[PDB]
Amino acid sequence: MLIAFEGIDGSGKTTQAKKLYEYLKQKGYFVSLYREPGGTKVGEVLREILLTEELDERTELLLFEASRSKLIEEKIIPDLKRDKVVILDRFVLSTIAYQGYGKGLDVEFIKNLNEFATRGVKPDITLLLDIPVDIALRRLKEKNRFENKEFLEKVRKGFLELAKEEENVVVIDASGEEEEVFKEILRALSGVLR
Amino acid sequence: MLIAFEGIDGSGKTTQAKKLYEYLKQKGYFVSLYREPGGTKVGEVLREILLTEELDERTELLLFEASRSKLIEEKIIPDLKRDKVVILDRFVLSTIAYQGYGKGLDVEFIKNLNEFATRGVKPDITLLLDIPVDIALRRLKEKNRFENKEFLEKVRKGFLELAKEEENVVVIDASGEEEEVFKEILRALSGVL
Ligand SMILES: Nc1ncnc2c1ncn2[C@@H]1O[C@H](COP(=O)(O)OP(=O)(O)O)[C@@H](O)[C@H]1O
Numbered sequence: 477m478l479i480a481f482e483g484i485d486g487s488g489k490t491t492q493a494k495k496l497y498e499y500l501k502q503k504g505y506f507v508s509l510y511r512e513p514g515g516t517k518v519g520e521v522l523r524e525i526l527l528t529e530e531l532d533e534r535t536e537l538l539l540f541e542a543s544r545s546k547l548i549e550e551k552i553i554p555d556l557k558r559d560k561v562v563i564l565d566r567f568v569l570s571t572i573a574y575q576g577y578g579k580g581l582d583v584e585f586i587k588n589l590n591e592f593a594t595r596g597v598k599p600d601i602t603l604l605l606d607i608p609v610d611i612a613l614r615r616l617k618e619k620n621r622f623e624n625k626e627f628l629e630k631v632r633k634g635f636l637e638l639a640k641e642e643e644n645v646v647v648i649d650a651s652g653e654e655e656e657v658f659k660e661i662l663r664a665l666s667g668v669l670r
Numbered sequence: 671m672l673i674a675f676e677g678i679d680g681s682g683k684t685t686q687a688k689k690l691y692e693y694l695k696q697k698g699y700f701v702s703l704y705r706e707p708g709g710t711k712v713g714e715v716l717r718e719i720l721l722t723e724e725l726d727e728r729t730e731l732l733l734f735e736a737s738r739s740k741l742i743e744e745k746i747i748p749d750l751k752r753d754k755v756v757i758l759d760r761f762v763l764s765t766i767a768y769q770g771y772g773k774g775l776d777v778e779f780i781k782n783l784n785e786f787a788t789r790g791v792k793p794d795i796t797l798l799l800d801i802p803v804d805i806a807l808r809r810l811k812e813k814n815r816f817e818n819k820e821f822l823e824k825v826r827k828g829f830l831e832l833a834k835e836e837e838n839v840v841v842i843d844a845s846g847e848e849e850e851v852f853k854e855i856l857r858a859l860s861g862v863l
Pocket residue numbers: 483484485486487488489490491492615616619650651652653654655657
């Protein structure tokens with residue numbers, strides 16, 4: 477089964493995805509954990525380009541999708557066939573929120589690309605880690621990571637509209653303390669798997 | 671203005687595009703020459719991935735477009751704005767013929783990605799270097815390059831259907847000698863330049 481974490485930078489996805497990976501493993505699931513972009517040899521090369529180079533927004537979209545396509549074909553589809561629980565730190569809603577709502581690229585076009593890269597694989601559940609931008613930015617600032625408030629305000633709202641419009645997205649209050657956040661996530665998952 | 675060379679591997683695009691670059695530069699044009707994939711620092715990184723890694727055909731398609739998008743935004747659009755003659759070694763028809771006719775990906779979808787990557791930038795003329803697959807292969811074998819005959823037969827045909835279906839495409843008989851081929855290229859261009 478497929479569990480996707482989504483949300484703005486500094487919402488706790490890395491943290492919570494790893495917490496979930498260890499928890500489910502301990503419970504006897506066979507689990508995989510992948511980040512996007514990245515998660516394959518080729519995707520990681522693309523992730524470094526995306527994080528280090530000055531790119532226009534079109535080229536960026538196409539690289540995010542290329543990384544996803546490699547991950548889907550190389551790892552996610554084979555994992556799912558073997559009944560692994562696949563946990564993703566970011567997936568298709570990040571593309572729509574960042575490239576669409578943030579950068580103003582066309583949302584229907586993005587969805588079509590998403591569908592092409594995924595071969596239509598969709599999550600059983602998406603956990604949206606919702607958090608006020610200013611709180612995310614203080615968390616990131618502690619680790620010397622700076623992100624753009626005006627941009628992230630639009631991205632946050634994108635994610636929240638997607639949570640209303642798209643299937644199987646649960647809005648998590650990610651402003652909580654780590655353990656409380658994790659317990660909300662467990663409650664959200666409780667219907668989809670044991 | 672924008673001039674694109676298309677065709678199968680070993681049809682002579684590198685050779686003829688550089689010929690044309692030198693010719694036009696001597697005539698006093700300010701000229702650029704770019705290859706696809708590649709042609710920018712980032713595009714060349716992508717080209718090396720495309721040429722060296724084992725990729726599925728969807729990831730390939732997306733990397734070809736990403737290289738094109740970088741080229742268009744970084745180089746082609748500003749070049750055209752300055753009235754350079756921009757010469758491309760491969761462009762959007764290669765994607766359709768290779769990924770579409772060759773690998774069986776959806777051609778409308780390909781075209782939509784092409785339109786996105788290019789911002790609608792189209793060539794003034796495309797020179798399709800048409801050649802029998804056997805001849806191209808022989809040319810390639812002499813430089814220790816080997817390509818797939820079955821695949822390339824489909825791609826060749828794809829390019830020929832597109833020369834019929836698409837606009838501003840001239841079919842060049844690329845089977846001749848270098849100067850004979852350049853001669854037909856100059857004939858086709860005097861329609862446009
Ligand atoms: N619930 C929390 N409260 C406060 N800080 C947190 C919480 N969860 C994670 N952090 C810290 O906030 C920062 C961003 O968390 P991270 O998991 O990397 O977020 P993301 O992957 O969404 O950008 C990290 O320094 C992390 O240790």
